[PDB]
Amino acid sequence: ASATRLIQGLRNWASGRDLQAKLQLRYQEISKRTQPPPKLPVGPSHRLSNNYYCA
Amino acid sequence: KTSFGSLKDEDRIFTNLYGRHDWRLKGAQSRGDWYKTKEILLKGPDWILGEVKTSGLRGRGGAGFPTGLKWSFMNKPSDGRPKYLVVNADEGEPGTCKDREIIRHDPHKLVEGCLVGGRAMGARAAYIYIRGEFYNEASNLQVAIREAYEAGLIGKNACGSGYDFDVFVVRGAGAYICGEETALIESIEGKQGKPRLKPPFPADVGVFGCPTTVANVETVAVSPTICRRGGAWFASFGRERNSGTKLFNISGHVNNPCTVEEEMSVPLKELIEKHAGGVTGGWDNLLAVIPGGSSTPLIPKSVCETVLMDFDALIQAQTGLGTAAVIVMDRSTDIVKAIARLIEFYKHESCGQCTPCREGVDWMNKVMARFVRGDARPAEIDSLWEISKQIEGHTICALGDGAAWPVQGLIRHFRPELEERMQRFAQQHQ
Ligand SMILES: NC(=O)C1=CN([C@@H]2O[C@H](COP(=O)(O)OP(=O)(O)OC[C@H]3O[C@@H](n4cnc5c(N)ncnc54)[C@H](O)[C@@H]3O)[C@@H](O)[C@H]2O)C=CC1
Ligand SMILES: Cc1cc2nc3c(=O)[nH]c(=O)nc-3n(C[C@H](O)[C@H](O)[C@H](O)COP(=O)(O)O)c2cc1C
Ligand code: SF4
Numbered sequence: 001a002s003a004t005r006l007i008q009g010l011r012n013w014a015s016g017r018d019l020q021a022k023l024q025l026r027y028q029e030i031s032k033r034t035q036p037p038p039k040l041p042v043g044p045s046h047r048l049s050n051n052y053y054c055a
Numbered sequence: 056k057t058s059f060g061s062l063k064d065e066d067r068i069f070t071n072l073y074g075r076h077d078w079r080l081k082g083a084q085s086r087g088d089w090y091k092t093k094e095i096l097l098k099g100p101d102w103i104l105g106e107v108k109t110s111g112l113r114g115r116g117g118a119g120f121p122t123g124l125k126w127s128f129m130n131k132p133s134d135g136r137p138k139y140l141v142v143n144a145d146e147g148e149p150g151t152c153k154d155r156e157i158i159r160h161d162p163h164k165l166v167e168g169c170l171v172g173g174r175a176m177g178a179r180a181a182y183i184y185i186r187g188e189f190y191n192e193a194s195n196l197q198v199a200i201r202e203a204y205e206a207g208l209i210g211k212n213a214c215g216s217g218y219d220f221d222v223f224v225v226r227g228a229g230a231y232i233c234g235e236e237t238a239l240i241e242s243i244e245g246k247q248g249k250p251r252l253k254p255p256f257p258a259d260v261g262v263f264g265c266p267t268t269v270a271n272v273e274t275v276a277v278s279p280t281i282c283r284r285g286g287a288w289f290a291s292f293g294r295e296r297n298s299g300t301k302l303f304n305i306s307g308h309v310n311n312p313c314t315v316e317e318e319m320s321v322p323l324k325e326l327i328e329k330h331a332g333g334v335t336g337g338w339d340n341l342l343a344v345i346p347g348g349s350s351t352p353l354i355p356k357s358v359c360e361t362v363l364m365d366f367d368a369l370i371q372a373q374t375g376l377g378t379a380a381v382i383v384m385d386r387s388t389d390i391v392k393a394i395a396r397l398i399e400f401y402k403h404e405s406c407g408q409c410t411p412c413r414e415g416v417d418w419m420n421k422v423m424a425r426f427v428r429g430d431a432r433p434a435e436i437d438s439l440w441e442i443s444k445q446i447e448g449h450t451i452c453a454l455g456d457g458a459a460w461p462v463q464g465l466i467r468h469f470r471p472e473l474e475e476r477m478q479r480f481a482q483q484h485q
Pocket of ligand 3: 249405407411450452453
C-alpha cells in the first residue's frame with residue numbers, strides 16, 4: 001500500500017482492475033489482537049422453574 | 056343446621072379444662088369421671104366400636120382419620136402376640152397446647168379413655184407416650200394413675216369386669232418427630248426417633264412388633280364420654296363428616312390467647328372475636344392466620360372472614376385443620392421472618408432419615424433466610440415452590456408435608472410481598 005503512484009498506475013493498468021480498492025495484504029483496518037473481555041449468554045435451559053429434564 | 060358453634064357448658068366434654076377444680080380422684084368422681092365404666096367394659100369391643108363409629112369421631116391428632124375405623128382394624132384375633140394401645144401425648148407442634156392441658160387438668164378422663172380404648176380393641180396395656188418437657192405434667196399424671204390403681208379402676212380386674220389392664224407413662228426426650236406415630240413407636244423401643252414406612256401400619260406391626268394403635272390424647276379422652284352420652288349426641292355437633300367438639304388454641308396476636316372447647320364447624324371470626332377478644336387492633340388489623348398450627352398453610356384475612364373451622368371447609372380453603380391451633384398474625388408482622396423461623400423450626404426438628412426432608416428442609420431454610428433479607432431475585436420464588444413440590448409426597452412421614460405446606464401457603468398468598476421485598480433490596484443495596 002506504500003507503493004508509488006507510478007508503480008500503482010502501472011499495476012492498475014496491467015491488471016485491468018482497481019487493485020487499491022481490494023488489497024490482499026491486510027493493514028490497520030483489521031481487528032485488534034488484544035480484545036475486550038466477552039460475556040457470553042446462556043441457553044434457554046438455564047431456568048429455575050418448569051425446568052425438569054424429562055420435558 | 057346452618058350455623059355452628061356457641062356451645063353451652065352442659066355439653067362440654069372437657070369440664071375442668073382450666074384447672075379450677077381438683078384434678079384428683081375425689082374431684083374426678085364429682086365430675087362424671089370413672090362413672091359406669093364397668094357397663095362399658097362388660098359390653099365387649101364391638102359395641103364400643105359401634106358407638107364410636109356412630110359418633111363420627113375423626114382423628115383428633117390432625118389428619119382426621121376415622122377413629123372408629125382406625126380402632127376397628129385391631130378387631131382381630133391374636134396369634135400369640137398381645138395387642139397394645141399407645142396414647143400420643145407428645146404435642147410438639149407450635150400453636151398446639153391442648154393435650155398438655157388434658158394431661159395437667161383432666162388426667163382421670165385420659166386414664167378412663169385408656170381403659171375404654173383398651174377394651175375396645177383388646178389392647179393389653181396403655182403406653183401414654185408423654186413429652187419429655189412435660190415433667191410436672193408427667194408426675195401429675197402419675198399421681199392420678201396411682202389414684203386410679205388404688206381405687207381398683209385400672210390394674211388387676213379393672214373396674215370389676217374380669218379384664219386386666221395397665222397404664223404406663225413413657226417420657227420422651229424433647230423431640231418433635233417423636234410425635235409422629237411410627238417414630239413414637241421407635242422411641243418407645245429404645246432407639247432413635249426415626250419413622251417407619253407404611254405399610255406395615257401400626258395395627259399390623261406397631262410397638263415391639265405387636266399390633267398397636269397410636270391415638271391422640273384428645274381422641275382418647277372423649278371416647279368414654281362418647282360411650283356414656285351416646286354416639287348421636289356427640290355426632291350432632293359440627294357438619295356431616297365433621298362430628299364432635301374440638302379444643303381450639305387461639306394464640307399469636309390476640310388479646311387473650313386461650314384454649315377453648317368449641318363445636319366443630321364454628322366460624323373463625325366468631326371464635327376469635329368471642330372467645331379470644333379479637334386480634335390486637337381488631338378485625339381491621341388482622342393480616343394472616345395460620346389456621347391449625349405450624350403444619351398447615353396460612354390463609355389471609357379475606358378468606359378468614361367466612362371460613363368454618365372444621366376439616367372439610369379448610370380443605371376447601373386449600374389448607375388443613377390439623378390441631379385446630381389458630382395462630383393469629385396482625386398487620387405489623389414481617390410474615391416472611393415468621394415463616395422462615397418456622398422452617399428453621401422444621402429443620403431443627405427433623406430426624407434426618409430420608410433424603411428429601413434431610414436435605415430440602417435445610418435448603419428451604421437457607422432460601423427463606425435469604426428471602427427475609429431479600430437477598431435473591433423473583434425467579435427463586437417459584438423454584439422454591441418446586442422444592443416444596445419435591446418434598447411433598449417424596450418422604451416417609453408427613454413432616455415433609457409440614458415443612459412444604461407453609462412455604463406453599465406463603466408463596467401462594469404473598470408472592471407480591473416477596474417480589475416487592477426483593478426489588479427494594481436490589482434498589483437500596485446496589
Ligand atoms: N397432632 C399434632 O401434634 C401434630 C399433627 N400434625 C398433623 O399430622 C398430619 C399427618 O399425620 P400422619 O399420621 O403422618 O398422616 P395421616 O395421612 O396418614 O394418617 C393419620 C392416621 O391415619 C391412619 N391410617 C391411614 N390410613 C391407614 C391405613 N390404610 N391403615 C391403617 N391406618 C391408617 C394412621 O394410622 C394414622 O394414625 C398432618 O396433616 C399434620 O397437620 C402435624 C404435626 C403435629
Ligand atoms: C411430624 C409429625 C409430628 C406429629 N406430632 C404429633 C404429636 O405430637 N401429637 C399427636 O397426637 N400427633 C402427632 N402427629 C400425628 C400422628 O401422625 C398421628 O396422626 C396421631 O398421633 C394419632 O392419630 P389420631 O388422630 O388417630 O389419634 C404428628 C405427625 C407428624 C407427621
Ligand atoms: S422426611 Fe424427615 S421426618 Fe420423615 S422419616 Fe425422613 S427425616 Fe424423618
